[PDB]
Amino acid sequence: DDDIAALVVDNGSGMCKAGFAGDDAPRAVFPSIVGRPRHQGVMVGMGQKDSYVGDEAQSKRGILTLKYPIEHGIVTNWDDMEKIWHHTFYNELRVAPEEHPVLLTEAPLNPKANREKMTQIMFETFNTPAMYVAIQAVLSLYASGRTTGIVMDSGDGVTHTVPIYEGYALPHAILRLDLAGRDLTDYLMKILTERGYSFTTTAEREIVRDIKEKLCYVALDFEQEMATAASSSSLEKSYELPDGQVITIGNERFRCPEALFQPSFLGMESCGIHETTFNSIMKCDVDIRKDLYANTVLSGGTTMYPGIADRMQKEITALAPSTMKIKIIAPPERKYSVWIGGSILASLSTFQQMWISKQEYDESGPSIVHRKCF
Amino acid sequence: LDAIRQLQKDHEAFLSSLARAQSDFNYLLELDQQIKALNVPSSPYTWLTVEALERIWKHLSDIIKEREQELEKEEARQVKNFEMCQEFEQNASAFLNWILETRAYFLDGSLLKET
Amino acid sequence: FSMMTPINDLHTADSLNLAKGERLMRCKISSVYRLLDLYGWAQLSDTYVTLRVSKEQDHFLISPKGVSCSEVTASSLIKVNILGEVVEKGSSCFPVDTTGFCLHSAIYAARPDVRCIIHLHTPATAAVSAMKWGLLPVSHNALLVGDMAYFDFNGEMEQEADRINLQKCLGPTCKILVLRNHGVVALGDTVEEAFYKVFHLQAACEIQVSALSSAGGVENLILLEQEKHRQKSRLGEHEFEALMRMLDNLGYRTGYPYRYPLVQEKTKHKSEVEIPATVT
Amino acid sequence: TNVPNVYPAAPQGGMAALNMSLGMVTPVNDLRGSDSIAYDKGEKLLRCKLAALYRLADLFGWSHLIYNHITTRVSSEQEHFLIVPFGLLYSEVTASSLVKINLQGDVVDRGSTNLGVNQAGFTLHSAVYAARPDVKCVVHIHTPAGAAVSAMKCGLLPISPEALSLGEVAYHDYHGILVDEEEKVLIQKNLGPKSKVLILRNHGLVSVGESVEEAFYYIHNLVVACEIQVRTLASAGGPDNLVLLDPGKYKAKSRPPAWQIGEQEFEALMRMLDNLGYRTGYPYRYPALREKSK
Amino acid sequence: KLEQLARRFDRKAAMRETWLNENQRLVAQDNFGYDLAAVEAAKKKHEAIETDTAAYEERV
Ligand SMILES: Nc1ncnc2c1ncn2[C@@H]1O[C@H](COP(=O)(O)OP(=O)(O)O)[C@@H](O)[C@H]1O
Incomplete structure (x- = not known):
């Protein structure tokens, strides 16, 4: 407590954040990538590792095959996650894992074996004293100052909407949808090939992601905006590539995020995000509908596109009943909020009963996490 | 002006009929008071009483009182619309005169010969 | 897997030429169609319910021919004249027949x-x-x-x-x-x-x-x-009102305005550290 | 999971599936353990039972909008009858939405809803409540077959063993005037000292019971016997074409975890309704339908 | 001008149609007074109404 602070480690699908509990800012945020060399190294004395992890891997993008250990919110390479956790504990923070508790976040709906494997890895090798698993979407509402409301989360893995009612996650009304930032980046490639610019390797995917981050916005009205873009060239902007070339994105700036609202562009038969949130509220009982319409919180990396707030408000107004209290509450720091909620939750004195001791794990195997943490 | 001309004329034509109307109305109220003096009939075979007639008379007076101001506003706006228009007309005509005369003198091109 | 259609399509249309009280009457008669469909009285369009919009402007609202009562919405209604001429057509790409309106037309001429x-x-x-x-x-x-x-x-x-x-x-x-x-x-x-x-x-x-x-x-x-x-x-x-409220609870976007509120809505439990709401 | 928001409707009678979809959302056991300074365990349990009875009455179609009322007794030391508030539909009724009023109609508990109760509609139940200290649950019902049975001159006929199980039927003639206190006196006269089923002519069918299960049993038997009579009295056309069962001979020959005489149907339909997802919280006589696997 | 006078036609016919409805409503009900004095009083009230309607026949 006083002597040692619990480690708050947020394992997002695209980025990984780490810091100490009770602190405002995470100490280290880095991409969750692992790269392996693809070319023969002929310089004898310059020093080449077998694999590069994190920011060191992203510095040398040209000579590596970048691989993501987390795929669609599901871990597909567990020793790769051992590497990313080793890099987090030893290099970024320079603290031993055996002397501090750790806090882990997770998707609202994950397989049981995934939780068991995380617990087994965290106790067996790192020998951490105490650990706890929390739902990613719950901690955002704690960071919001709220205990009742609907939380929409969208990262690089998957986009899900949950309702929370005085700290209770309703399991039936949690809805999932496969519209993440990675799919938007792939669609950005697919629409960039029209102008004449071709990107094909995993190195250029980071360039396309940076283009998506820096030059995109959400149209309030799609049909008017297409006519506006066809009429004039005032919407066009120029981006300057790492090799010195200059591209003109032009029309596609409001075509990249539009796959969120109309998933038929990507070939998916599912409904839009607004319909997903509307159906998520529709599945709950009547009594809590009024405080779900009157209380909506946006979170996640994808939700920082400019103009997403007004478009979201209009699209959820179009589906809501008449004279209904509708408001969207989007904090400016909405994709650092999960770490903030984790540090807040670890800061409390009544939270210290949540910790799982080493003796408890040694007695009850890796299956104790589900009984101890509901 | 001419529509609002003739509408002012038939408004003061309507006041002459209003004089006949109030003469008939006070004749009727005197006859009704004469009827009311003997054994007090209110209205033996008709819905109409004195106070209903007074009410509709006041109502008509209120509406003509409003409509005289309405016509005053209309005629004021119409005359205010011609005044700046016919100010504009003479300035436009002087504009035409000077521009055609000066451009015709320069169109002759005799300045380069006589010097 | 669902018959459920939003009965209010006035916001998505954003077109047409409307009276000052027309857009509420459209929703009301669409709801009347939905109730008569739900009880099992009628399924096939035969010009059942007709409504007069205004005393002076006439322009009576009827259902289009060919659309079953389950599929009728607010924007699909057609404003016709007393004789059968089309005053205004909503977003419904169907041939226009006003034969069934003749049964209601003389009643319009009889009682206002x-x-x-x-x-x-x-x-x-x-x-x-x-x-x-x-x-x-x-x-x-x-x-x-x-x-x-x-x-x-x-x-x-x-x-x-x-x-x-x-x-x-x-x-x-x-x-x-x-x-x-x-x-x-x-x-x-x-x-x-x-x-x-x-x-x-x-x-x-x-x-x-x-x-x-x-x-x-x-x-x-x-x-x-x-x-x-x-x-x-x-x-x-x-x-x-009870029927409209129950359809609102199910989820139909009924535009009928309620004269009195349903629930008291006791004030919830407030914290100061809230981010101020709305997107302004 | 994998279930539509609203259930697809039949070609006829969309009210059944529609109220099913509404009951999927709204639980009838609205109480979850909040503060209740006036509630008792028996009062809360009877509130849940009454809400479930309202939803079950809506589910079979034994309902004519909101113009019928069902009242129960809290069995406190003074008055306190529970009634639905005036205005809410039967599929909207929850446990906390029910309104406790007095015998003369004074609202002692306004409940969770702002809608007041109908003062005129409670006098018919108040006449029965003042008539008998034994009665505790009064159900007023309107089915078309029952209305057709009430509209004929002869009334109910002993043609089925279920009508014989009904026993003596009190008949109340349609005055249509609602003359208040003498109307109450005439109800007391026609109902008699002991009776199970009342038929208020040309308007409705009334069941009275010491418990909710008893009233449900009586009204179910009455409705089913009425719709038995409808077809056969139509086809007969006279006494020369109808066999009448002898009441006395048939009744003489025919006659804790243990069930009552009317708890079986109530518990079976409560099992059905909880399998639907209404989560009524009714105390079952046996918690499981079958033995747990070993 | 002709569209203005058509809209005046609509506004003028509104009152006529409402009045036709209103005297339809009041001639619909029948309540004769008891005995010959009240019967003939109702008769002369009817003649008063009949003389009243001929005034608006001109407006029609
Ligand atoms: N400033 C920004 N502008 C636009 N998009 C951004 C921005 N920052 C992050 N993103 C998008 O968010 C994604 C990262 O989401 P992240 O918050 O890491 O997900 P998780 O919740 O799994 O941690 C990136 O793919 C990126 O496209």
Whole structure:
């Protein structure tokens, strides 16, 4: 407590954040990538590792095959996650894992074996004293100052909407949808090939992601905006590539995020995000509908596109009943909020009963996490 | 002006009929008071009483009182619309005169010969 | 997997030419279609409910031909004239037929105090329409209906003289008309009163059919005398709000405005560290 | 999971599936353990039972909008009858939405809803409540077959063993005037000292019971016997074409975890309704339908 | 000008149609007074109404 602070480690699908509990800012945020060399190294004395992890891997993008250990919110390479956790504990923070508790976040709906494997890895090798698993979407509402409301989360893995009612996650009304930032980046490639610019390797995917981050916005009205873009060239902007070339994105700036609202562009038969949130509220009982319409919180990396707030408000107004209290509450720091909620939750004195001791794990195997943490 | 001309004329034509109307109305109220003096009939075979007639008379007076101001506003706006228009007309005509005369003198091109 | 369609399509349309109170009447008659579809009375479009928008401008709202009552929405309604000419067409790519409006047109020419006319073709009401002495008030609901007028129907009313006989047989003050062999027609100043009378007369007809079957004769039944039978809420105001509220709870985007709130909404438990809400 | 928001409707009678979809959302056991300074365990349990009875009455179609009322007794030391508030539909009724009023109609508990109760509609139940201290549950129902049975001269006929199980039937003639206190006196006269089923002519069918299960049993037997009579009296056309069962001979020959005489149907339909997802919280006589696997 | 006078036609016919409805409503009900004095009083009231309607026949 006083002597040692619990480690708050947020394992997002695209980025990984780490810091100490009770602190405002995470100490280290880095991409969750692992790269392996693809070319023969002929310089004898310059020093080449077998694999590069994190920011060191992203510095040398040209000579590596970048691989993501987390795929669609599901871990597909567990020793790769051992590497990313080793890099987090030893290099970024320079603290031993055996002397501090750790806090882990997770998707609202994950397989049981995934939780068991995380617990087994965290106790067996790192020998951490105490650990706890929390739902990613719950901690955002704690960071919001709220205990009742609907939380929409969208990262690089998957986009899900949950309702929370005085700290209770309703399991039936949690809805999932496969519209993440990675799919938007792939669609950005697919629409960039029209102008004449071709990107094909995993190195250029980071360039396309940076283009998506820096030059995109959400149209309030799609049909008017297409006519506006066809009429004039005032919407066009120029981006300057790492090799010195200059591209003109032009029309596609409001075509990249539009796959969120109309998933038929990507070939998916599912409904839009607004319909997903509307159906998520529709599945709950009547009594809590009024405080779900009157209380909506946006979170996640994808939700920082400019103009997403007004478009979201209009699209959820179009589906809501008449004279209904509708408001969207989007904090400016909405994709650092999960770490903030984790540090807040670890800061409390009544939270210290949540910790799982080493003796408890040694007695009850890796299956104790589900009984101890509901 | 001419529509609002003739509408002012038939408004003061309507006041002459209003004089006949109030003469008939006070004749009727005197006859009704004469009827009311003997054994007090209110209205033996008709819905109409004195106070209903007074009410509709006041109502008509209120509406003509409003409509005289309405016509005053209309005629004021119409005359205010011609005044700046016919100010504009003479300035436009002087504009035409000077521009055609000066451009015709320069169109002759005799300045380069006589010097 | 669902029949559920948002009954309010006024915001997504953002077009057309509307009156100052038209967009509420559209939603109200669309809701009337939804209720008559849900009870199983009608499924196939035969120009059942007609509404007058304004006393002076006429421009009566009817359903398009070809769209079943389940699929009718607010923007799909068609504003026609008294003769059958198209005043305004909504977003409905269907051929326009105003033949069924002719049944309501002379009633519009007869009584102005009615705005809503509801015609039925249910088997019970059509059996009562074929029932030669008409509705026998042997039940409480038939007593609640009121007085009736009976009119012979030859199936056509384009003729200039048939209209005179229709408005003769309707009478000056009668809000229920029974056409022989052609079901029933209900007449109301508001859609609420007309819907209430439709429901009550349908229940009375359903009672009467079973009664005439089971008794086998008039003498086996009892009939209470019409002379013996002989804040403020309007005749259909109270029930129709409950129906609209229940459809709102299910999820239909009913545009009907509620006169009084449902729940008290006790003030919730407030924290100061809230981010201030809304997107402004 | 994998279930539509609203259930697809039948060609006829969309009210059944529609109220099913509404009950999927709204639980009838609205109470979850909040503060209740006036509630008792028996009062809360009877509130849940009454809400479930309202939803079951809506589910079979034994309902004519909101013009019928069902009242129960809290069985406190003074008055306190529970009634639905005036205005809410039967599929909207929850446990906390029910309104406790007095015998003369004074609202002692306004409940969770702002809608007041109908003062005129409670006098019919108040006449029965003042008539008998034994009665505790009064159900007023309106089905078309029952209305057709009430509209005929002869009334109910002993043609089925279920009508014989009904026993003596009190008949109340349609005055149609609502003359208040003498109307109450005439109800007391026609109902008699002991009776199970009342038929209020040309308007409705009334069941009275010491418990909710008893009233449900009586009204179910009455409705089913009425719709038995409807077809056969139509086809007969006279006494020369109808066999009448002898009441006395048939009744003489025919006659804790243990069930009551009317708890079986109530518990079976409660099992059905909880399998639907209404989560009524009713105390079952046996918690499981079958033995747990070993 | 002709569209203006058509809209005046609509506004003028509105009152006429409402009045036709209103005297339809009041001639619909029948309540004769008891005995010959009240009967003939109702008769002369009817003649008053009949003389009243001929005034608006001109407006029609
Ligand atoms: N400033 C920004 N502008 C636009 N998009 C951004 C921005 N920052 C992050 N993103 C998008 O968010 C994604 C990262 O989401 P992240 O918050 O890491 O997900 P998780 O919740 O799994 O941690 C990136 O793919 C990127 O496209």
